[PDB]
PDB file of C-alpha atoms in Angstrom:
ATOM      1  CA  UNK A1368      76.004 137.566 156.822  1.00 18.18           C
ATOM      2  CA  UNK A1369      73.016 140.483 158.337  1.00 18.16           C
ATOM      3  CA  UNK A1370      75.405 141.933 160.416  1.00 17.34           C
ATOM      4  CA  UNK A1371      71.880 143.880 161.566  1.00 14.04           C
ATOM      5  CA  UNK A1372      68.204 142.505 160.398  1.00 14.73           C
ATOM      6  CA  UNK A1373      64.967 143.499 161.146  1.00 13.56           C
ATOM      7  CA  UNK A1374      61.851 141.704 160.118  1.00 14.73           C
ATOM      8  CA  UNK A1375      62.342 141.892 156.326  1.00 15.06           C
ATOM      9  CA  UNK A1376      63.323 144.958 155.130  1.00 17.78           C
ATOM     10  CA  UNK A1377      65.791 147.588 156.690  1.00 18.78           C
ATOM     11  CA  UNK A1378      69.482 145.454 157.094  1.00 20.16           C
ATOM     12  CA  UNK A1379      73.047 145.835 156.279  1.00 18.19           C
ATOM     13  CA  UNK A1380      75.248 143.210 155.517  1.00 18.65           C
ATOM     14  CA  UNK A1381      78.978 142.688 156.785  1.00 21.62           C
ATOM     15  CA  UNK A1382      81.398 140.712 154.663  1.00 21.37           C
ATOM     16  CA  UNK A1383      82.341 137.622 156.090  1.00 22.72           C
ATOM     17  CA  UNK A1384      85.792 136.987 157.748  1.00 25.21           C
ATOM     18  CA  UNK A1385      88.560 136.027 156.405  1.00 27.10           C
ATOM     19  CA  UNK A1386      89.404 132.268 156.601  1.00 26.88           C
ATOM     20  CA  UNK A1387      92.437 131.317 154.876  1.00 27.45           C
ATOM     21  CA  UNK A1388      92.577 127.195 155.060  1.00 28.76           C
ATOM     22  CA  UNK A1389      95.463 125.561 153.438  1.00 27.46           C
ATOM     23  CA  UNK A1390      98.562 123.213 154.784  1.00 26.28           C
ATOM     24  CA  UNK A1391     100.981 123.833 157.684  1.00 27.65           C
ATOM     25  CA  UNK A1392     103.874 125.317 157.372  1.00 24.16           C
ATOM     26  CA  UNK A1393     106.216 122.344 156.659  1.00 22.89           C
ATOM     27  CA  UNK A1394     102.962 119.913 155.896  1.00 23.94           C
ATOM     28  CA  UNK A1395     103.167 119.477 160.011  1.00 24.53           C
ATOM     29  CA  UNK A1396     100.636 117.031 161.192  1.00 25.54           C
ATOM     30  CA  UNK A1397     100.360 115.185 157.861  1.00 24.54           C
ATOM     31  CA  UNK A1398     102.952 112.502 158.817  1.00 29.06           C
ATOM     32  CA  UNK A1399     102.396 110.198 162.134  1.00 30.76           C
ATOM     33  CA  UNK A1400     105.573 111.172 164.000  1.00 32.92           C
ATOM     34  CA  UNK A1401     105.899 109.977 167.674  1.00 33.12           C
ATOM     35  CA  UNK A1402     102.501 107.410 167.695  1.00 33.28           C
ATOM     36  CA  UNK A1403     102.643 104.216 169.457  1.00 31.96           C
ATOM     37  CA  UNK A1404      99.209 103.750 167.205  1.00 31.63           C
ATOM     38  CA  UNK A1405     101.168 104.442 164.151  1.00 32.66           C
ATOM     39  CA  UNK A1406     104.966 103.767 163.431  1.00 31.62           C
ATOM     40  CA  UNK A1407     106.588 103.373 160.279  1.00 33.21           C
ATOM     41  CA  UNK A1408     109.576 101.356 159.332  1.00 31.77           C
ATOM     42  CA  UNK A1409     112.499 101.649 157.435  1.00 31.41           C
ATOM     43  CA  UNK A1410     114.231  97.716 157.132  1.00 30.20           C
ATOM     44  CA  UNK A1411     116.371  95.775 154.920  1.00 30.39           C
ATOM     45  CA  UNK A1412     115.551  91.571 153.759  1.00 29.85           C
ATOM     46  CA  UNK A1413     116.776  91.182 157.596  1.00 26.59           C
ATOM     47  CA  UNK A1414     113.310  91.502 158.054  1.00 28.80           C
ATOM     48  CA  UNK A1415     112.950  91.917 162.003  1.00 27.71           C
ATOM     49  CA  UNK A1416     115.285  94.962 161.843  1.00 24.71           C
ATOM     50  CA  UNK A1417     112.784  98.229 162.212  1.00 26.30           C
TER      51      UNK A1417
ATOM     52  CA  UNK B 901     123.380  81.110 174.494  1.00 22.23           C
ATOM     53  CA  UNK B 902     125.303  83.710 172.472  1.00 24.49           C
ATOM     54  CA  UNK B 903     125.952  87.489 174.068  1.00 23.87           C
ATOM     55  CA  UNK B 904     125.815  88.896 170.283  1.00 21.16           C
ATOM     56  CA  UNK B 905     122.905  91.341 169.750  1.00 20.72           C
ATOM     57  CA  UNK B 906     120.444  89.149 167.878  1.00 20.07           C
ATOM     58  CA  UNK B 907     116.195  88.943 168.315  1.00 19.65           C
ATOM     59  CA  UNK B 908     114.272  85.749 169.248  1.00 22.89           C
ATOM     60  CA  UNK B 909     111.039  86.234 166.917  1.00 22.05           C
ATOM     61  CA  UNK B 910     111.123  87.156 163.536  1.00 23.42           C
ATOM     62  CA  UNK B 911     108.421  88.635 161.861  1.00 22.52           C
ATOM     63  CA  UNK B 912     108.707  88.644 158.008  1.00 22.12           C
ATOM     64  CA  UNK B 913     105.960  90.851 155.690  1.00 18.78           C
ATOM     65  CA  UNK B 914     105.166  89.162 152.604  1.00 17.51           C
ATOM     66  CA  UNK B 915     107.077  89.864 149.542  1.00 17.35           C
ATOM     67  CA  UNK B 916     104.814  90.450 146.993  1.00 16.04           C
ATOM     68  CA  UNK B 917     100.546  88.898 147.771  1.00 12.62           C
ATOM     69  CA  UNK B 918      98.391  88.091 144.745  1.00 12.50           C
ATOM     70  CA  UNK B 919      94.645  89.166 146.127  1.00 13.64           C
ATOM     71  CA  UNK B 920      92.034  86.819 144.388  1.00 13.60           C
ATOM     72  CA  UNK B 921      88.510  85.990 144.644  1.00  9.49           C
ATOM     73  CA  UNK B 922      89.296  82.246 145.531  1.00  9.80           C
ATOM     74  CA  UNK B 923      92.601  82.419 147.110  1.00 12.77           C
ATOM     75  CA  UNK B 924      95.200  84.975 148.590  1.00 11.71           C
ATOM     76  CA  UNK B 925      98.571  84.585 148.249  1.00 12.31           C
ATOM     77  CA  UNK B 926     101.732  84.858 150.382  1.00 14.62           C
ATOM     78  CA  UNK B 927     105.164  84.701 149.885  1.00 14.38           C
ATOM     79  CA  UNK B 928     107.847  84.930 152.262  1.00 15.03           C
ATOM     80  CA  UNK B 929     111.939  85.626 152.098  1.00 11.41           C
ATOM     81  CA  UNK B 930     113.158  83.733 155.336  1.00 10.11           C
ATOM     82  CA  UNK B 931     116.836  84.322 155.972  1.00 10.35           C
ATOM     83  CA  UNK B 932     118.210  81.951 158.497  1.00 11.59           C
ATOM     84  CA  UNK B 933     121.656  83.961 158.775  1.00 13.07           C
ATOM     85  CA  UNK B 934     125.097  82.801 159.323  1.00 14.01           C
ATOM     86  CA  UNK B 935     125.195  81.028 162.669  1.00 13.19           C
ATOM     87  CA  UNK B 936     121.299  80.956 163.609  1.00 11.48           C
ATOM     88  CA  UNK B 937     118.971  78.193 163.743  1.00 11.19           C
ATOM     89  CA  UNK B 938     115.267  77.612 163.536  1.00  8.61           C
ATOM     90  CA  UNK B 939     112.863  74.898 164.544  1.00  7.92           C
ATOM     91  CA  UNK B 940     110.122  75.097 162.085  1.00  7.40           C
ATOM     92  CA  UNK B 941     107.782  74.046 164.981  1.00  6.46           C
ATOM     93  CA  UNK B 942     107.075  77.791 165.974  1.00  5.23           C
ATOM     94  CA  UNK B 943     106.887  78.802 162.543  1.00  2.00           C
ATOM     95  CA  UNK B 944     102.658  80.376 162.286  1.00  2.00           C
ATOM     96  CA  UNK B 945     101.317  82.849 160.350  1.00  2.00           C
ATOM     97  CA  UNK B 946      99.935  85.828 162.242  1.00  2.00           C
ATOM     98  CA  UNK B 947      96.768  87.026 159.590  1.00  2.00           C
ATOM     99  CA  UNK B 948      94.617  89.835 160.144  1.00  2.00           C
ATOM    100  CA  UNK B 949      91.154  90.535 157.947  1.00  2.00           C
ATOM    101  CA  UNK B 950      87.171  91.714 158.685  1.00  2.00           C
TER     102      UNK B 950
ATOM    103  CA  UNK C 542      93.403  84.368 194.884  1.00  2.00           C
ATOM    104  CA  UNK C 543      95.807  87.002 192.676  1.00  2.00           C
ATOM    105  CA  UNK C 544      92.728  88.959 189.941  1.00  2.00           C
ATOM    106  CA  UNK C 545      94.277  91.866 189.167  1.00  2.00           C
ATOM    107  CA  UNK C 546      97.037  89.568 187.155  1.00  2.00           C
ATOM    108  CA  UNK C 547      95.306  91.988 184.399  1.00  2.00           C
ATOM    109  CA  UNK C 548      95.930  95.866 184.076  1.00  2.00           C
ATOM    110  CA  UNK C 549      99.929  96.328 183.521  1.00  2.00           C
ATOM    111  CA  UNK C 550     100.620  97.535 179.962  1.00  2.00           C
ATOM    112  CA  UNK C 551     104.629  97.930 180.228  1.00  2.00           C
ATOM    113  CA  UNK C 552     107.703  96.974 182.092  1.00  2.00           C
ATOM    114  CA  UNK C 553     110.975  98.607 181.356  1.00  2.00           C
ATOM    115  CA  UNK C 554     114.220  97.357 183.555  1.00  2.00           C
ATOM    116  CA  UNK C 555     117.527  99.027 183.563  1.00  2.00           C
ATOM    117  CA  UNK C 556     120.858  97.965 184.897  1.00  2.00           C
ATOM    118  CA  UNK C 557     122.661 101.347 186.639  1.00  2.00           C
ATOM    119  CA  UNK C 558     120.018 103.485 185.052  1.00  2.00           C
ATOM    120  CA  UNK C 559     121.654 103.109 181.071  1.00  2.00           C
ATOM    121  CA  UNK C 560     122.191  99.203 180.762  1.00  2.00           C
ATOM    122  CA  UNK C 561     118.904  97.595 179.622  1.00  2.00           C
ATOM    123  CA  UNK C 562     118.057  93.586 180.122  1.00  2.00           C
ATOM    124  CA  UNK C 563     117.824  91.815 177.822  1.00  2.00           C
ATOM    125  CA  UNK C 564     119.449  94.591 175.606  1.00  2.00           C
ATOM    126  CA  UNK C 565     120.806  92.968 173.048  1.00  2.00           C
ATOM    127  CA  UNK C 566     117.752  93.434 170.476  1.00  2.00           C
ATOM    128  CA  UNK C 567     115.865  89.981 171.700  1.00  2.00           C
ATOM    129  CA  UNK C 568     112.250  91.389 171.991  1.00  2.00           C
ATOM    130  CA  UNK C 569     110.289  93.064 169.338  1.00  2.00           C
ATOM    131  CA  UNK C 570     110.068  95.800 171.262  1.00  2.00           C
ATOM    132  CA  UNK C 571     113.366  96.141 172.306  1.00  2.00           C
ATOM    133  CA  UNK C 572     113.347  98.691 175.532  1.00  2.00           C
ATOM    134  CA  UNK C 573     110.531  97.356 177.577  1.00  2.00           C
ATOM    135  CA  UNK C 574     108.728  94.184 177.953  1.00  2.00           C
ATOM    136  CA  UNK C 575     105.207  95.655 176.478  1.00  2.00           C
ATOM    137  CA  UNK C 576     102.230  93.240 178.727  1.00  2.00           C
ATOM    138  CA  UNK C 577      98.956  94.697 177.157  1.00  2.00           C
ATOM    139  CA  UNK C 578      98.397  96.241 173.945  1.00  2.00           C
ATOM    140  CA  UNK C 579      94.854  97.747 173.470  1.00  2.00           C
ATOM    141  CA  UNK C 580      93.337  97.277 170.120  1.00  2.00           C
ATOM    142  CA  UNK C 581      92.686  99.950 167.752  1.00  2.00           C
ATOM    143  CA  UNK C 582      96.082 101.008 169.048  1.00  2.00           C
ATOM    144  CA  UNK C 583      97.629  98.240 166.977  1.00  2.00           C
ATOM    145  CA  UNK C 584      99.230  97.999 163.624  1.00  2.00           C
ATOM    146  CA  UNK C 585     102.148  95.102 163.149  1.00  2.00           C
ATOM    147  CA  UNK C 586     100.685  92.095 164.665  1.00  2.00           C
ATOM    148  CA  UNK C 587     101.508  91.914 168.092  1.00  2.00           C
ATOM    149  CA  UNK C 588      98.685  90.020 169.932  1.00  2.00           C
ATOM    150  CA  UNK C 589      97.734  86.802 171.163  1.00  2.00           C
ATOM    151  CA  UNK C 590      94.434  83.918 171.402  1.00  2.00           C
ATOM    152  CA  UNK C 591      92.412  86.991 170.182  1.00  2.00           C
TER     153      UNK C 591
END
């Protein structure tokens, strides 16, 4: 990424940093958990019973 | 009135919906349990689209 | 000449700080009588004459 530059010529280049993305430990923060936006259910044919 | 721990307004998802271009379909499991009782005057549907 | 009827979200009510009325499942949201509910923060229904 030019970690110096000048004009056109004379410039060294740094590697770029290390940037690891993948998924959270656990898959945290895939899953709404505590949302009033967004609540799942677990019911039975009792229907109203969340 | 009762004391027993039962709700006042049920809300039932469909069963199983058959999405067509000329019609959409719902069907619905109501259970009226041993010793309840419903008026079918409050019964509505409660749909949500764009 | 009562106009700000409006902006109250929530009530909760509790009988010697444990008891809750009227705890015996009878709202759909059992713990507290919910007054507003702001949508886009809305999944299951829930809200009335648009």
């Amino acid at each position: 990424h030019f970690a110096d530059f000048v004009d056109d010529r004379r410039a060294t280049a740094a590697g770029n940093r290390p940037n690891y993305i993948g998924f959270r430990d656990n898959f945290i923060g895939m899953m709404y958990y505590n949302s009033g936006s967004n609540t799942g259910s677990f019911s039975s044919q009792t229907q109203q019973l969340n | 009135t009762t004391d027993r721990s039962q709700k006042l307004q049920l809300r039932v998802v469909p069963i199983q919906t058959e999405d067509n271009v000329n019609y959409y379909k719902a069907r619905f499991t109501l259970n009226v349990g041993d010793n309840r009782l419903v008026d079918l005057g409050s019964s509505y549907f409660d749909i949500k689209g764009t | 000449t009562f106009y700000l009827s409006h902006t109250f979200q929530r009530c909760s009510i509790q009988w010697d700080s444990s008891v809750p009325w009227p705890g015996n499942d009878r709202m759909l949201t059992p713990n507290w009588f919910e007054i507003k509910r702001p949508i886009n923060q809305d999944a299951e229904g829930n809200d009335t004459m648009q």
